[PDB]
Design a protein around this ligand. Sequence first.
Ligand code: HEM
Ligand code: HEM
Ligand SMILES: CCOc1ccc(-c2ccc3c(C)cc(N)nc3c2)cc1CN
Ligand SMILES: CCOc1ccc(-c2ccc3c(C)cc(N)nc3c2)cc1CN
Ligand SMILES: C[C@H](O)[C@H](O)[C@H]1CNc2nc(N)[nH]c(=O)c2N1
Ligand SMILES: C[C@H](O)[C@H](O)[C@H]1CNc2nc(N)[nH]c(=O)c2N1
Ligand SMILES: [Zn+2]
Lengths: 418, 420
Amino acid sequence: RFLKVKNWETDVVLTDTLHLKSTLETGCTEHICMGSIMLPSQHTRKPEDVRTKDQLFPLAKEFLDQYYSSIKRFGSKAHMDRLEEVNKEIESTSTYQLKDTELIYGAKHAWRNASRCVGRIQWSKLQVFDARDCTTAHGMFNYICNHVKYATNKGNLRSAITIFPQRTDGKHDFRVWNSQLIRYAGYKQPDGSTLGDPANVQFTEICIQQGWKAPRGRFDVLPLLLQANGNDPELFQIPPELVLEVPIRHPKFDWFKDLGLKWYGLPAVSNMLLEIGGLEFSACPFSGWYMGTEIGVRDYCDNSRYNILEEVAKKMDLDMRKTSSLWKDQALVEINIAVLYSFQSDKVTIVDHHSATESFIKHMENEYRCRGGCPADWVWIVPPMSGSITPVFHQEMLNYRLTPSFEYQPDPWNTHVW
Amino acid sequence: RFLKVKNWETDVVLTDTLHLKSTLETGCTEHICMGSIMLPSQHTRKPEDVRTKDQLFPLAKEFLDQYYSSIKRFGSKAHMDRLEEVNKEIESTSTYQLKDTELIYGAKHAWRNASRCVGRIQWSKLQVFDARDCTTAHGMFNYICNHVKYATNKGNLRSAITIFPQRTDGKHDFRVWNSQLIRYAGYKQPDGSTLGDPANVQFTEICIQQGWKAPRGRFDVLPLLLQANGNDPELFQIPPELVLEVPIRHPKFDWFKDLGLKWYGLPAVSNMLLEIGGLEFSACPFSGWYMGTEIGVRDYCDNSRYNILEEVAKKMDLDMRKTSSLWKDQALVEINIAVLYSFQSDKVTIVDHHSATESFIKHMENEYRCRGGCPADWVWIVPPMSGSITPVFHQEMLNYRLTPSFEYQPDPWNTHVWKG
Ligand code: HEM
Ligand code: HEM
Ligand SMILES: CCOc1ccc(-c2ccc3c(C)cc(N)nc3c2)cc1CN
Ligand SMILES: CCOc1ccc(-c2ccc3c(C)cc(N)nc3c2)cc1CN
Ligand SMILES: C[C@H](O)[C@H](O)[C@H]1CNc2nc(N)[nH]c(=O)c2N1
Ligand SMILES: C[C@H](O)[C@H](O)[C@H]1CNc2nc(N)[nH]c(=O)c2N1
Ligand SMILES: [Zn+2]
């Protein structure tokens, strides 16, 4: 019940006491571990499930309890008043509103509890943008452009999140239909293949279905599809001058430029759901900065993505006859070298997976020492390449669901009543 | 209860019904996943936990029921009598003996149930050597030498397992004290540096204390340390001609040979515990053939192992002045290229991690189809390098514990009552 985690590269041993405060479930049992399932039920929030007055007050109390404890005002007049106050508003309005300070604590701590996120050492430095006064898609678009501009910062990226109005009755949900603010378009081909980004083929079609006019190029930045107050969603193009992009060249292989590769600097996830004291913020786009492998290993080399490995290996003149030459691996390494190099050269913020895993280990040590633990999903913290030469590999981790939290939610087109 | 797993690269969806036939715990609860803990309590077997007739027959019957189903004899006269036979023998003698066929089924299925093993496609082709008549350390040394000779097979490796007498009262255990039959020594120098394999420093010291004349080189094959019937362990030198080794060179880099590296061909794990129908076999060495990354990534590049990365990078003339150059990644690929090249060049059986994972995916699908499941520990199945360009990465997996099964067990020097 007071659990121990060990690093097998350093013999460091941490005691975890924080898992005791765990609220939600993991999808695992004593009989079967599901720690490798992508989207178990508990990590997803279906929109039919609106909160009731009785479920909502305990959730609100538990949030306010930790909030006021963090500010060293636990059990104090201020704490009591607030609980009283929130309690009253719930009894009357069947919901409640977060104070700005709480909202900020909420956001920051949702990130802090993101067990799958390796970049959490930066959790306290998050820029929170209150957009709960927003009422239209145009209004949403404006907030999102401002987020994107504040975040990009001419390459010197800064973490940020913009929070739109909380769910009410499921009929008035704010939703960004894009999974990321900035993503490349994917087009089905009559000759069979796929142009651009295969992971976006469906969305890119729904964009065209809703009236987008696509350049049908290979790195076409998609338009935003914004849904305010449960209404039908609207198409807005992000101003080109606000979408920072980095041409991909290699520091040694001058032919690399010829592949014509580029990526965008701003990783900004928009389809998740921020939950705070029982309140459901279904549009809450948030951003930081890439880890090299995310673009280079996954976005470029994964089969269901750009899949350029064969093409790169070819230009390297590696022996591609047999898998045991590890040509796939060799290529994969140069590709990530190039991505790191392109970004650094353009002075666009990026972290390599060695630096970032080392940072996380520090963060862990910090959280165990000052918080008594740090929930963590090993399957997602260990980088998709060079796994065991990074320190997170030998680090035992405990995975459990704290709150406030980011959660998954169904894609809007499945659920949106038109 | 039916369960689904998805592959996110091919959109294949499989249904697991085999998890229902699961007994042992995982170490997880609803409120915590411990899927990354290396040796959970339930994956281990302490020798003091010796089984009473109480729980033994339920376990016996479960296993016998499994066996006779596989051979399509469930409920047959032979099945009923065997149950009765095992029943009498337990209430009469507090344990029982497996028949030859039963022991073979058991060992094969423990492999098949080994959720952390990527190589289980080969599970049905396991050579089982019954060493249950063994009574001495010298008897063990002989069985073990024969295991090594058979399994090596001049470099064309064969899967084998040798099975020594089951535990009784936990005071007469058979143990092989080596973590592997073949492993290099490790010596803690005075200056803090280690010579050889850092992994084996402690075990080396024991051997040295037991009276092993240590040659003290970077690649010394350790002596077998063998305990029969609860007696104090004894030192045996594996005959060098039986230990197949491969000098490591690189197919393009000529200076790589001058790193002085080599490795043994035959991975043979000896410190685990074979559980079959309640019986515990505390000494049951098993061997197959290496996946390349085991040597190249873990054995050579782990900071707590030979840790040659810096010297390789130095000789490759990489930019080692910041991680951003991915020199650590770059050298690691070279070293694994070298290990695969050297082995294949010498016609010693080895598999690359691309071939191995692709095979496992195929195996697993096959297992879902004709068994209703395949337990698998993602954390262990996914290769320690180039993870997401192998097809196991995007494959969702269920982990659960079936019997028969291989378990962990405490190091013998920690639990052994010495005689002198
Ligand atoms: C500042 C630099 C950051 C880095 C380097 C980073 C890195 C990562 C990486 C590598 C992943 C795994 C995703 C994948 O590889 O496919 C991830 C997941 C995630 N990150 Fe972070 N991130 C950063 C900032 C943030 C911020 C600002 C937030 C929230 C405000 C956040 C919350 C999350 C969440 C919620 C997930 C997925 C969790 C889940 O699916 O359960 N991260 N991040
Ligand atoms: C023949 C080729 C084989 C290959 C390529 C192979 C591969 C592997 C690998 C790579 C691991 C993970 C070890 C690590 O990297 O730390 C593993 C684990 C394991 N394998 Fe296999 N293996 C083979 C044969 C066998 C055999 C013959 C047995 C038993 C009869 C076996 C049973 C196991 C067990 C019990 C584990 C660890 C499970 C645990 O710790 O719970 N494997 N295997
Ligand atoms: C299949 C959907 O899974 C995801 C879930 C979350 C993220 C994610 C979410 C936020 C991130 C942030 C904020 C920064 C960053 N560098 N990477 C991030 C990655 C990525 C993925 C893509 N593997
Ligand atoms: C802390 C103990 O962890 C392990 C557990 C099992 C194995 C293992 C066990 C059996 C193997 C076999 C039979 C073949 C092979 N190629 N590799 C094998 C590797 C290795 C290790 C070493 N990481
Ligand atoms: C902490 C974690 O359980 C530990 O480092 C594991 C991770 N996965 C592994 N996977 C394999 N195949 N071998 C290992 O030794 C490990 N080590
Ligand atoms: C099935 C498996 O869980 C899935 O492929 C996971 C594995 N680990 C991952 N890790 C990260 N960082 N991102 C991912 O998308 C995934 N995918
Ligand atoms: Zn689990």
